[PDB]
């Protein structure tokens, strides 16, 4: 029971009306957009690298070539809930072996030494499933987190996002805290030659396939991207010839308040109740970390309101990360019978109706829309700034992308490169969604690397 549709009318005007907070105008996209190509400019500079939120990171990863090796390279993959190892063959490349790891919560939280042990038992137990142990491997670590790179293989871990917060880790060499853990377990041997960020690793993989692929950029749990800077400008590094790939750590734009006039009351509450309070704001606007989330407190004001749900939520609905990204994604999917959204909300103990299901899907497309437009402003920014950078007429130029959000939510995508293509005249964009590119990439740089 519950009909009137001129009743379900006005309560879905009175959502619309809650929801328009979420909008983003051209305008507040170019104006987030100049501030993020601001913050750019501030973290390549010596004189404001240190208070720059933007740390435009270098990664030692070069323009080459070089000295390619081939044959069989190791490749770990550290930085979402899993973990990854990789055995790559490089000829002339192919992923030949893979296993993926759940990282249990006490290793993410506890003590680095735990964590790394964790993953120096998963390096064991991926070399017996393929009687690998006694040989020696070339190694390649993409390494999710923010890191300074004092070379290819060496670097330190500056802070954990995404809720990582192992004690023991910031302010430490990540290839010592690897290597130190593969030693006091004495099974295996390795050598570890490189360090990657996830975007790195991307870009690197798609590179591989395509030669104008210069861009990697994650959208999954957490968000960020690389590109390849011209050597003049990386202040950090000495040196003019050629190109060094940055990492611009720009999921921590807005921490120094740039962002200040778009976040909402939302943004605050899941800010607040992170892991890393005032930290990579502009992440927590996109990431899939996040995204659930903010579903999950707008439909409690919808709920408080009298909008949703006849102004009850269920105890599911009041659990933290209870309306998981991965809904936000399916809820989007629906083809419009309601089925999917009904599924969700029955299942998170809600008993919805048709009008609860339409208004699930609304604050659902405002919360990806919104992420969508916020990510493709700092992408329109690292573009433009290459554009101007390399003083091309038309630019013409590969994005490489990994990440469950740009991959797997049935609109962001659209979304996002309509949006990126509004703000990018003079551009020519394609995207590339990179097969692996975090595991193959890692190897693929080791090779380059190990000669
Ligand atoms: O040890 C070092 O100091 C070191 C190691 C490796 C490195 N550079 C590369 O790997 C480049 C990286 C691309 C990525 C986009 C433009 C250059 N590469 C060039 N070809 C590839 C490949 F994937 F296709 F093999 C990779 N720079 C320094
Ligand atoms: O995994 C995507 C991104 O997540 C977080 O923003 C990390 O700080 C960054 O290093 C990584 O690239
Ligand atoms: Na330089």
Same mark, same amino acid.
């Given at each position: 029971?519950?009909?009137?549709?001129?009743? +379900?009318?006005?309560?879905? !005007?009175?959502? =619309?009306?809650?929801? %328009?907070?979420?909008?983003? +105008?051209?305008?507040?996209?170019?104006?987030?957009?100049?501030?993020?190509?601001?913050?750019?400019?501030?973290?390549?500079?010596?004189?404001?690298?240190?208070?720059?939120?933007?740390?435009?990171?270098?990664?030692?990863?070069?323009?080459?070539? =070089? *000295?390619?090796?081939?044959?069989?390279?190791?490749?770990?993959?550290?930085?979402?809930?899993?973990?990854?190892?990789?055995?790559?063959?490089?000829?002339?490349?192919? &992923?030949?072996?893979?296993?993926?790891?759940? #990282?249990?919560?006490? %290793?993410?939280?506890?003590?680095?030494?735990?964590?790394?042990?964790?993953?120096?038992?998963?390096?064991?137990?991926?070399?017996? &499933?393929?009687?690998?142990?006694?040989? &020696?491997?070339?190694?390649? $670590?993409?390494?999710? /987190?923010?890191?300074?790179?004092?070379?290819?293989?060496?670097?330190?871990?500056?802070?954990?996002?995404?809720? /990582?917060?192992?004690?023991?880790?910031?302010?430490?060499?990540?290839?010592?805290?690897?290597?130190?853990?593969?030693?006091?377990?004495?099974? /295996? !041997?390795?050598?570890?030659?490189?360090?990657?960020?996830?975007?790195?690793?991307?870009?690197?993989?798609?590179?591989? =396939?395509?030669?104008?692929?210069?861009?990697?950029?994650?959208?999954?749990?957490?968000?960020?991207?690389?590109?390849?800077?011209?050597?003049?400008?990386?202040?950090?590094?000495?040196?003019?010839?050629?190109?060094?790939?940055?990492?611009?750590?720009?999921?921590?734009?807005?921490?120094?308040?740039?962002?200040?006039?778009?976040?909402?009351?939302?943004?605050?509450?899941?800010?607040?109740?992170?892991?890393?309070?005032?930290?990579?704001?502009?992440?927590?606007?996109?990431? *899939?970390?996040?995204?659930?989330?903010?579903?999950?407190?707008?439909?409690?004001?919808?709920?408080?309101?009298?909008?949703?749900?006849?102004?009850?939520?269920?105890? +599911?609905?009041?659990?933290?990360?209870?309306?998981?990204?991965? $809904?936000?994604? +399916?809820?989007?999917?629906?083809? @419009?019978?309601?089925?999917?959204?009904?599924?969700?909300?029955?299942?998170? @103990?809600?008993?919805?109706?048709?009008?609860?299901?339409? #208004?699930?899907?609304?604050?659902?497309?405002?919360?990806?829309?919104?992420?969508?437009?916020?990510?493709? %402003?700092?992408?329109?920014?690292? #573009?433009?700034?290459?554009?101007?950078?390399?003083?091309?007429?038309?630019?013409?130029?590969?994005? *490489?992308?990994?990440?469950?959000?740009?991959?797997?939510?049935?609109?962001? &995508? =659209?979304?996002?490169?309509?949006?990126?293509?509004?703000?990018?005249?003079?551009?020519?964009?394609? $995207?590339? !969604?990179?097969?692996?590119?975090?595991?193959?990439?890692?190897?693929?740089?080791?090779?380059?690397?190990?000669?």
């Amino acid at each position: 029971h519950h009909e009137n549709l001129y009743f +379900q009318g006005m309560k879905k !005007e009175k959502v =619309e009306q809650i929801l %328009a907070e979420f909008q983003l +105008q051209e305008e507040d996209l170019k104006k987030v957009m100049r501030r993020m190509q601001k913050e750019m400019d501030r973290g390549l500079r010596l004189e404001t690298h240190e208070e720059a939120s933007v740390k435009m990171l270098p990664t030692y990863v070069r323009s080459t070539p =070089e *000295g390619s090796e081939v044959g069989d390279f190791l490749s770990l993959d550290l930085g979402g809930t899993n973990f990854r190892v990789m055995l790559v063959k490089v000829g002339e490349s192919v &992923k030949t072996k893979h296993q993926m790891y759940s #990282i249990p919560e006490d %290793a993410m939280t506890g003590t680095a030494e735990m964590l790394f042990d964790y993953i120096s038992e998963c390096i064991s137990d991926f070399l017996d &499933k393929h009687q690998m142990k006694h040989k &020696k491997l070339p190694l390649g $670590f993409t390494f999710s /987190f923010p890191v300074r790179h004092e070379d290819i293989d060496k670097g330190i871990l500056l802070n954990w996002t995404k809720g /990582f917060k192992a004690s023991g880790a910031e302010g430490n060499n990540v290839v010592g805290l690897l290597r130190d853990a593969i030693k006091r377990r004495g099974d /295996f !041997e390795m050598d570890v030659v490189a360090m990657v960020n996830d975007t790195v690793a991307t870009m690197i993989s798609c590179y591989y =396939e395509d030669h104008q692929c210069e861009v990697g950029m994650i959208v999954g749990t957490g968000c960020n991207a690389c590109y390849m800077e011209e050597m003049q400008n990386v202040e950090l590094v000495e040196g003019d010839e050629g190109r060094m790939c940055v990492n611009t750590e720009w999921g921590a734009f807005g921490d120094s308040g740039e962002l200040d006039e778009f976040l909402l009351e939302y943004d605050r509450l899941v800010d607040e109740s992170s892991a890393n309070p005032g930290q990579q704001l502009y992440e927590k606007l996109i990431g *899939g970390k996040y995204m659930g989330e903010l579903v999950r407190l707008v439909l409690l004001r919808l709920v408080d309101e009298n909008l949703l749900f006849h102004g009850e939520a269920s105890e +599911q609905l009041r659990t933290r990360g209870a309306f998981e990204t991965r $809904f936000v994604s +399916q809820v989007e999917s629906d083809t @419009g019978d309601r089925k999917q959204i009904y599924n969700i909300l029955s299942t998170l @103990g809600l008993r919805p109706s048709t009008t609860d299901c339409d #208004i699930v899907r609304r604050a659902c497309e405002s919360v990806s829309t919104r992420a969508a437009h916020m990510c493709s %402003a700092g992408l329109a920014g690292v #573009i433009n700034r290459m554009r101007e950078s390399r003083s091309e007429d038309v630019m013409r130029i590969t994005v *490489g992308v990994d990440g469950s959000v740009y991959k797997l939510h049935p609109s962001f &995508k =659209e979304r996002f490169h309509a949006s990126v293509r509004r703000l990018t005249p003079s551009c020519e964009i394609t $995207f590339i !969604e990179s097969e692996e590119g975090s595991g193959r990439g890692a190897a693929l740089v080791s090779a380059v690397a190990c000669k």
